[model samples]
Target: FSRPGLPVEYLQVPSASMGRDIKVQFQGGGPHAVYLLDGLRAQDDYNGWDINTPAFEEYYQSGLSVIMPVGGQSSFYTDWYQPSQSNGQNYTYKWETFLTREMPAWLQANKGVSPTGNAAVGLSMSGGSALILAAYYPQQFPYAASLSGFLNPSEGWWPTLIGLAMNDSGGYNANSMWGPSSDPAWKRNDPMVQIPRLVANNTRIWVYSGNGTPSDLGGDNIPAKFLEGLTLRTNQTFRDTYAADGGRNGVFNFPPNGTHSWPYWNEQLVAMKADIQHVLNG
Candidate 1:
């Protein structure tokens, strides 16, 4: 019920879309805020940002507030079209509605967080989603970043991969998320596919990925199935897509060697701090 000595203000925000009260951890340093999302296997009890990384501590007293939304595992942070009973998902996932509208609305009305001009950032499963949030709700999130995200979920084998991961993580059905492989909703959630919207909005974008090689920080903690090549390709595609689409507000980073773990993400998060300060100040 509490994080002793931590400055986070625990708030319960009721989401009409999800039909429940969502927990949010907040640290208000100033007017601007950053919504930090979690990865796959995101727990109902805690946001992964606080569990696996130094995000909260790093942003502490930096004058930019930190907002962590709890739960939404296997949800991809998207609104589901149908509940997948086969995967035990009897309830609808209206994450997009909750995040882009409900949560922010509640914050503005109660918590003193404005409904617009914030940043969205996440790693792993949520990495791509942060950009999607910014792309769709451009004014609300002027800055977005994806750390080791599967950017092109609608491309190649990504849909299959995402479907497998969702089911494995929480028995969630991908069909229920965006619908069949033919559903435009897949592309609708794809960050690379939404380059036009992101570009047109002039969203300050930061994307980072690492090759499979283990970094000193990550330290031989590679998963059995190292997704280095796959993850790197995803962001690479995003980079080329943004360029092809005449996008100039994007900053892409690919370290020579690293794994898909918290260490890489932590470094990148701090690495983007300067840019974050610049854009939020803009």
Candidate 2:
């Protein structure tokens, strides 16, 4: 919805793969696009990017089509091998299909947006997802960023962490998404494992993490710091892997102190805006 001279649209797009309609919040006029993905506890109504953070609001002046998809709580923005039942609701998430295939075509045909060479930014859970999207579908997303993301989700100890977080978030099951630890789908979707693809694509990437030191923006929350500490380890591993794989087209930022909260991510979005703009304009 928009007032006079305001360029914004609210739309519901039905996804055949997910068997549900997805809500999309659109802002600005564009021949290019930028996707702002949500975190682990994503809500059904609107993304935290629209409500909790000033990132998207600032981007409204940038002249790119800013797309924010709603819902998908506890789903890692991937296609699930099996349907999951949680909170008396069944989730058949085909987010990868919805985002990469359906949404892009829809945006091009309906909104006059470019279907390829888009940019994406995600925080926490979605941070890894954004990278995976760029790696797997290089032509579609040439630039991507992850802020405090658990990039090595299929690696040691991460499967356990992901399961616990999913269960706590909404009683969702990681098994439903990709089966057990033995499942090949785990490695298939792991951003660390897909480094070669990213390298081949020469994707413009930005990775950011903090050492979980208490910052003025994040306050002194014990739980936030502890969780961020774990993500810091994963992010470092991702950085190392990217370097080992001969990737040199990305930037990595690890501040001495921060938490896995919106404040840090908000700062990251602001910090990375120039890079994102350059790529989008390219």
Candidate 3:
């Protein structure tokens, strides 16, 4: 961790909502904060950020701090309507508040990070959460990103995947991912729906996804299936709809022949950091 920058502290907060502790890894130095969120199925017990790439020591030189919240699994970083599983576990969909509010307060109060000088990004499952955090609390995180993110929460294989996860979790459901399917919250949380808000705030975006055509075989070849058109449409939406509509400043990159795995993610991560510098410097 130090090699990447400077190994800082790890803060663990116990959440009554999830009946689990939230683990946050801090690296780099100074008041500015940049969050790096993890994927689905990842646990507080796991270190997904470090597992796939180098530590954030590189950011220390930039006088920026890196904050990583481990694991949202299928939590989608939202408040959950039901108790998690049959373990008598309590899960909270208030993660949006935690990362955007509670955690920022804690960082400011204890870790010496400034509450106002912060930004965030995420990969895979957490990518959506990162966007949610930015949209819901734009003042807290004016800069945000989604790497290989599942941007459209209301369509495609998402509902089907949710159904399968619910069954596997012993009857857990996504009724509250953004309230009911009939509720406006679903649209409110969808990035596509929040484009105006994001553009209104002039939020900085660093989006990257594999542009290769996906070859899905019903989860038989999860790799090829998942990486298909990872961040293209989201980028396109921002460019064509957002920018073309006079939205705001953003940087969207689509790499050819990339996959949804770590190798591609790591490459993009470094590139995104360069972008952060470019954006922040400007």
* Best candidate (score: TM-score): 1
Off by over 4 Å in 3: 1-5, 14-20, 85-88, 162-172, 211-235, 278-282
The list of candidate 1 runs beyond 4 A from truth reads 1-5, 213-226
Q: lDDT of each model, Cα atoms only?
A: 0.83, 0.81, 0.64
Instruction: Give lDDT: candidate 3, residue 82.
Output: 54
**Which pairs of residues clash in candidate 1, taking residues 3 or more apart in a chain or in different chains?**
none
**Quick one: ranking by lDDT, best first?**
1, 2, 3
Q: What does candidate 3's lDDT look like per residue over 1-282, in tens digits?
A: 327325666888665545566788777565777787776555555456766567475566675788877766556677655555443445545676677667777777776778774677776666666777777677777788887676766655555454454434334456645555656766666776677777887888777666554321012223444435534565466456667657767777675677656667767777777667655544
For lDDT, candidate 2 versus 3, the one ahead is 2
Candidate 2 accuracy as lDDT: 0.81
Of the two candidates 1 and 3, the one with more favorable TM-score, higher being better, is: 1
The per-prediction CA RMSD against the true structure, in angstroms, equals 3.3, 3.2, 3.7
Q: How many residue pairs clash per model?
A: 0, 0, 11
Task: Please tell me which model should have the higher TM-score, number 1 or number 2.
Answer: 1
- The digit string of per-residue lDDT tens for model 1 on 1-282 reads 323565877789999987889999889887789999888788888887778777877887787889999999877898899887586665799999999889988988886888888999988778889999998898889999998888988887778877777777777788988988779999999998899999999999999887765521111223455455777887888899899999999999987765667788888888888788889965
Give the range of the ten consecutive residues with the poorest summed lDDT in model 2: 215-224
List the candidate 2 regions with Cα displacement exceeding 4 Å.
Answer: 1-6, 213-226
